[PDB]
């Protein structure tokens, strides 16, 4: 419960990106890290006190600003492909425990043309499974999205559910061996047989997508692939 913002960002090389960090632990030390395979976290800048900043281990291409005990900002002035990473900020008491922020997925691109939202489909429980097991599995595929920042949740009878749910740890590449490959992801929800067989019952697959903002200019003959929700749905049966 330290926060940083935006939660995600897509940018073109040369664009300006500003990540913000805010902490109310009354900590004095704050830090900005990037995390990505197969390094771990890497320090960019940090601060001991209001109005001062220190070069971290990788200060190049980034600037920092510590306007207050509570705020620490990171600015990428002319965005590059190597700045694609997950950025965490952090705060710490000097002799105590360090806390990390929730993170920002930042994606940098030659152009925004490659950016696509998910198409989303649901698959109904096999009758074979029901006959055999008396339980029923629904499957959600989100396909064709780029970049790969989505959050998928199931809503049963209009309420989010967690018992009987499993989603892949991460999305899979549609053509794993090249550049600008697009992503897919599946998730499972299993219920009792007498639950699918209730035709009053409503199952929705929800995938939150993190893409462009309103302010990015858009030339393609289609819906600007903006941050948006995409869903699919099914009712019980038989």
């Amino acid at each position: 419960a330290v926060t940083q913002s935006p939660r995600s960002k897509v940018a073109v090389t040369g664009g300006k990106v500003t990540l913000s960090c805010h902490q109310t632990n009354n900590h004095d030390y704050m830090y900005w890290y990037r995390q990505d395979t197969g390094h771990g976290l890497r320090l960019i800048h940090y601060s001991y006190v209001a109005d001062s900043t220190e070069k971290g281990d990788i200060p190049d291409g980034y600037k920092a600003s510590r306007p207050s005990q509570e705020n620490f900002s990171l600015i990428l002035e002319l965005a590059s492909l190597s700045q694609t990473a997950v950025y965490f900020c952090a705060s710490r008491l000097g002799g105590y425990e360090q806390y990390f922020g929730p993170g920002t997925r930042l994606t940098v691109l030659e152009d925004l043309k490659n950016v696509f939202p998910p198409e989303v489909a649901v698959f109904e429980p096999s009758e074979a499974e029901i006959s055999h097991t008396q339980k029923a599995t629904l499957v959600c595929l989100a396909t064709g999205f780029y970049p790969d920042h989505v959050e998928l949740s199931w809503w049963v009878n209009g309420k989010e559910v967690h018992s009987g749910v499993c989603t892949d740890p991460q999305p899979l590449k549609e053509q794993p061996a090249l550049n600008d490959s697009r992503y897919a992801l599946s998730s499972r929800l299993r219920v009792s047989a007498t639950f699918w067989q209730n035709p009053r019952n409503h199952f929705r697959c929800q995938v939150q997508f993190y893409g462009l903002s309103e302010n990015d200019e858009w030339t393609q003959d289609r819906a600007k692939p903006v941050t948006q929700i995409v869903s699919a749905e099914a009712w019980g049966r038989a």
Binding site: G95, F100, L138, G164, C166, D168, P169, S186, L189, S192
Partner: protein, 183 residues
């Protein structure tokens, strides 16, 4: 300077788990964090935390995880801070995978119409991607039907292609020789 051990391990839920952190010099304090892939860095320990995880020093710090459960699966990292203020130095993490105890395994593969569903295999089993570059197979994950207390393993194969069929979706995996294939 900081060294974790092992690099990775896999245990059955219910087993206890001891992870290792070893530092070069005199530390000052030492923190353990935890992170699922995709998730954020959770500070577990600055000792105990609620009681189910604990820690020890000896500079060999080590973390004990009682009755591991599937939701313990993630990455465990060790950070040492050699002064009240000098920056943390993070070990390399340990990949923990906790894997369900499947009592009555029921290796099966089904067809789901709007996909192929490998399911109910007992944990020993492992799932391979296809060499077939237009077929899509996912890694197993475990689903916990807390309701009727049941844990299930599963994976999904699919591709828009006529040839592909649930009888052959997992040919690249070694699958129980008595896996049930419905008509």
């Amino acid at each position: 300077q900081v060294e974790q051990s092992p690099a990775s391990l896999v245990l059955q839920e219910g087993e206890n788990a001891e992870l290792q952190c070893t530092y070069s010099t005199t530390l000052n304090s030492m923190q353990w964090f935890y992170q699922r892939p995709g998730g954020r860095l959770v500070s577990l320990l600055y000792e105990q935390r609620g009681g189910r995880l604990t820690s020890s020093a000896a500079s060999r710090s080590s973390l004990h995880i009682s009755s591991s459960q599937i939701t313990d699966s993630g990455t465990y990292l060790c950070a040492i801070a050699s002064s009240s203020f000098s920056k943390l130095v993070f070990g390399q993490g340990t990949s923990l995978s906790v894997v369900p105890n499947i009592q009555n395994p029921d290796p099966a593969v089904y067809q789901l119409r709007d996909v192929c569903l490998f399911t109910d295999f007992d944990s020993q089993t492992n799932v391979s991607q296809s060499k077939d570059s237009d077929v899509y197979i996912t890694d197993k994950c475990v689903l916990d039907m807390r309701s009727m207390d049941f844990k299930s393993n599963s994976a999904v194969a699919w591709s828009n292609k006529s040839d592909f069929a649930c009888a052959n979706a997992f040919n690249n995996s070694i699958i129980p020789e008595d896996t049930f294939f419905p008509s």
